[PDB]
Amino acid sequence: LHKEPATLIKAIDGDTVKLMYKGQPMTFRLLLVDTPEFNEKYGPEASAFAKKMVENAKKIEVEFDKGQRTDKYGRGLAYIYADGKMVNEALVRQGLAKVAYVYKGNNTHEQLLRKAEAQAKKEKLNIWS
Numbered sequence: 001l002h003k004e005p006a007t008l009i010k011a012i013d014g015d016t017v018k019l020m021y022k023g024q025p026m027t028f029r030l031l032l033v034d035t036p037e038f039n040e041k042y043g044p045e046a047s048a049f050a051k052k053m054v055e056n057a058k059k060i061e062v063e064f065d066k067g068q069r070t071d072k073y074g075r076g077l078a079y080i081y082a083d084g085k086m087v088n089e090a091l092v093r094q095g096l097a098k099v100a101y102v103y104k105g106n107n108t109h110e111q112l113l114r115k116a117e118a119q120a121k122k123e124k125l126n127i128w129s
C-alpha cells in the first residue's frame with residue numbers, strides 16, 4: 001500500500017471526513033471501522049477525537065487498500081493518516097470505534113486494528129467501559 005497526499009476540507013464525524021484528493025473534494029469513509037453516529041452514545045466523543053486529529057495535523061495522507069476505492073455512496077474508502085498516525089487505528093485504540101465492515105480484499109490492516117481493539121477492550125475504554 002502507498003500513502004498519498006490530501007488536505008483537510010472539513011471534519012464530518014467519527015469515521016467520515018471531507019478531504020481534497022488529487023485536487024477534488026471527496027468524502028472519505030474510514031476502512032475497517034465503525035464509530036457510533038453523532039446522536040448515539042460515544043458518537044460525540046468519536047467525532048471530537050477524529051476532528052482534533054485531522055485539524056491538528058500538518059500532513060494528511062490517504063492510503064487506499066487493494067480493492068474498491070469508492071463505496072456505493074461515492075465515498076472514498078481509505079486509511080487516513082495524520083502526521084504519520086493512522087486515524088482508523090487511533091479511534092479503535094481509544095475504544096471510540098469497533099473493527100467492522102471487514103470485506104475481503106480491502107482488509108490489509110485488519111489484524112493491526114484488531115490488536116488495537118483488544119487492548120482498548122482490556123482497558124475497558126469508552127465503548128468497552
Ligand SMILES: Cc1cn([C@H]2C[C@H](OP(=O)(O)O)[C@@H](COP(=O)(O)O)O2)c(=O)[nH]c1=O
Binds near residue numbers: 032103
Ligand atoms: C466501511 C464501508 C462501508 N460500506 C457501506 C456498508 C454500509 O451499507 P449500508 O448503508 O446499506 O448499511 C454502509 C455503512 O457506512 P456507515 O457506517 O457510514 O453508515 O457503508 C461499504 O460498502 N464498504 C466499506 O468499506
Ligand SMILES: [Ca+2]
Binds near residue numbers: 015034035036037
Ligand atoms: Ca458509523
